[PDB]
């Protein structure tokens, strides 16, 4: 393989393009990189464990990995209190050590192994233009992805459960026993609108629906894996797509961009798969928490919170949603679709119930609302909490804010990468990625426009 | 400090409302547009004058021929956008002309602001809002924003004036 411009036509700043047709070095690149991902997982987990104060809420402490492990049900109890520090440490150590194994294997294949795998084995050696082998690799990796989704199902059903924030008695690690196998609910989540009140798949509000979706995903991915091992692409697919390594890269780039946007919105809105005991309140959660906190405070002073008009004529504490539901007032009218385990006990069939607001508010709901309104996902880049006009004394930016911003930006730049690699794949397959040929310039043969 | 000067000219001069500034914004954003669109158009209508996928080494500074197709670029932008450059000399003079004219026009507006000759108000909308308290536009909202920024910023920004503004005189909306 050429490791310079004169022998490849690619500069140093585009060097990894020198690997496109070197499958062994490409595999080593791919495997060393996986090393890196598992390395960050393990080392970041060990960092977060070392900096963790377990009696303090995770979201106060700049943690984005321990909430993921805690949502799986490890090292936590009721209300997300940390029982034991050892499962988080175990997850870190196992990733870190394995990452050493993956890094050694990538270096081998990259530096010492055969540069092309096609002269060594037909099973592992691939040509990008060989549609059967490409779909075989899709198929192997789909069976593995389905096995991973079924492993999440097995953790929730058979090996200790997941954290359910919606659990009666308070949020707790519970074992899922009746997952939603009903395909109407599971795929009607896919059919729901990506707008307010509907939320597409971001609105999944119970662990039974989540675990049932992963049974179906596991089944769908395993079936699609066998499909693609046993079959070859059909004529419409062969005539519709570009068949090259850069093309398949760009297809994956568009896919990754879509999932990055979905992940940013998921962590910004959903409090079920991202429980607020670990990630802190959502922005909608915190705004409704402030409205509830001052409803409770002024009700304790003797305000008639239902008959109180504000300055505009709308109700100061309670008002009507556009479909009529009894909701909190002020600007949080926007957030009347919010649902949370601290709030839903005060909701009736028509919305917020006057009787429950008068004589069913518990002290823990007040405590949770005060904590969530003061841990709103508002913060500066140097991690100064609250509104931006506040002074420097509160060191806090929400993990929801960090995760959402990161993945939105990642998703955008991966769309840019999709456009770049798709466009280049199209031009390279069509033969003009290196520029216009002067003799056969296509515009010089076209008629004039006017 | 430059950011302070910027916000100062907003709240005290309504410098966003000044057409001389708006022409400057048009010139600067247009010059950035022209930079981006011209660089991308040249880099994507390049002639294949070399064998590498690295297209940068297919150019020589002593060569007499154009390194990119003006004809293909003109056809591309004529079909995409409706019009296109057909004259390279006019293209580059326009690339000069737009941000320089923007800078000169914004300078004229700043000379106006030197004497407090502002485009602060639309007097017709002020008289209508003064006589009719249902009439609200975005212009009147921006006037209220400037009022608040002036009153809250002036004692610390002009400490030599010894502005003592008690808390009760500061304009503020409900609950903030």
């Amino acid at each position: 393989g050429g490791r310079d411009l004169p022998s490849t036509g690619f500069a140093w700043w585009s060097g990894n393009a020198r690997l496109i047709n070197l499958s062994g070095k490409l595999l080593g690149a791919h495997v060393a990189h996986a090393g890196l991902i598992v390395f960050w997982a393990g080392a970041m987990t060990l960092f977060e464990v070392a900096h963790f104060i377990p009696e303090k809420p995770m979201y106060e402490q700049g943690l984005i990995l321990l909430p993921h492990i805690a949502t799986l049900g490890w090292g936590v109890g009721p209300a997300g209190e940390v029982t034991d520090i050892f499962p988080f440490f175990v997850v870190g150590v196992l990733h870190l050590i394995s990452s050493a194994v993956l890094g050694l294997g990538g270096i081998y294949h990259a530096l010492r192994g055969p540069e092309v795998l096609e002269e060594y084995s037909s099973f592992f050696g691939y040509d990008w233009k060989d549609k059967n082998q490409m779909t075989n690799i899709i198929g192997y990796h789909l069976i593995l992805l389905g096995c991973g989704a079924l492993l999440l199902v097995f953790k929730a059903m058979f090996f200790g459960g997941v954290y359910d924030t919606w659990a009666p008695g308070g949020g707790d690690v519970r074992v899922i026993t009746n997952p939603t196998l009903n395909p109407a609910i599971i795929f009607g989540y896919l059919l729901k609108a990506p707008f307010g009140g509907e939320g597409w798949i971001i609105s999944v509000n119970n662990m039974e629906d989540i675990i049932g979706g992963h049974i179906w995903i596991g089944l769908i991915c395993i079936s699609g894996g066998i499909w693609h091992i046993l079959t070859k692409p059909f004529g419409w697919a062969r005539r519709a797509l570009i068949w090259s390594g850069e093309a398949y890269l760009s297809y994956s780039l568009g896919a990754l961009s879509l999932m990055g946007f979905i992940a940013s919105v998921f962590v910004w809105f959903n409090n079920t798969a991202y429980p607020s005991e670990f990630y802190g309140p959502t922005g909608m959660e915190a705004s409704q928490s402030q409205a509830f906190t001052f409803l409770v405070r002024d009700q304790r002073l003797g305000a008639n919170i239902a008959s109180a008009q504000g300055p505009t004529g709308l109700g100061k504490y309670l008002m009507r949603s556009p479909s009529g539901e009894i909701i909190f007032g002020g600007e949080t009218m926007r957030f009347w679709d919010f649902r949370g385990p601290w709030l839903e006990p005060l909701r009736g069939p028509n919305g917020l119930d006057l009787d429950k607001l008068r004589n069913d508010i518990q002290p823990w709901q007040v405590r949770r609302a005060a904590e969530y309104m003061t841990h709103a996902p508002l913060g500066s880049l140097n991690s100064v909490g609250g509104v931006i006009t506040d002074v420097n004394s509160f060191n806090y930016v929400s993990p929801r804010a960090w995760l959402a911003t990161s993945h939105f930006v990642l998703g955008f730049f991966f769309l840019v990468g999709h456009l770049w690699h798709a466009g280049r794949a199209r031009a390279a397959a069509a033969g003009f990625e290196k520029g216009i040929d002067r003799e056969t310039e296509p515009t010089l043969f076209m008629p004039d426009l006017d | 400090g430059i950011f302070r000067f910027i916000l100062f000219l907003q709240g005290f001069h309504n410098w966003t409302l000044n057409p001389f500034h708006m022409m400057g914004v048009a010139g600067i954003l247009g010059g950035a547009l022209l930079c981006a669109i011209h660089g991308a158009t040249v880099e994507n209508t390049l002639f294949e004058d070399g064998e590498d996928s690295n297209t940068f080494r297919a150019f020589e500074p002593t060569q007499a021929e154009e390194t990119y197709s003006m004809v293909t670029a003109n056809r591309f932008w004529s079909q995409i956008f409706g019009i296109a450059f057909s004259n390279k000399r006019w293209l580059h003079f326009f690339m000069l002309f737009v941000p320089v004219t923007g800078l000169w026009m914004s300078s004229v507006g700043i000379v106006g602001l030197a004497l407090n000759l502002r485009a602060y108000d639309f007097v017709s909308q002020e008289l209508r809002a003064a006589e009719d308290p249902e009439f609200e536009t975005f212009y009147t909202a921006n006037i209220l924003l400037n009022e608040g920024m002036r009153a809250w910023m002036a004692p610390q920004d002009q400490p030599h004036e010894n502005f003592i503004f008690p808390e009760e005189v500061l304009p503020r909306g409900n609950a903030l």
């Binding site: 004039d448 | 004809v71 003109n74 409706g82 019009i83 057909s86």
Partner: peptide, 30 residues
């Protein structure tokens, strides 16, 4: 009646856009 003047200047700009596209000086190689 200031609305009439605003509509007129915006209409003049849009009409200039139409005539500048549909009846442009056609680019010719000579």
């Amino acid at each position: 009646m200031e609305s009439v003047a605003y509509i007129l200047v915006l209409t003049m700009a849009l009409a200039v856009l139409f005539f500048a596209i549909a009846f442009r000086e056609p680019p010719r190689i000579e």
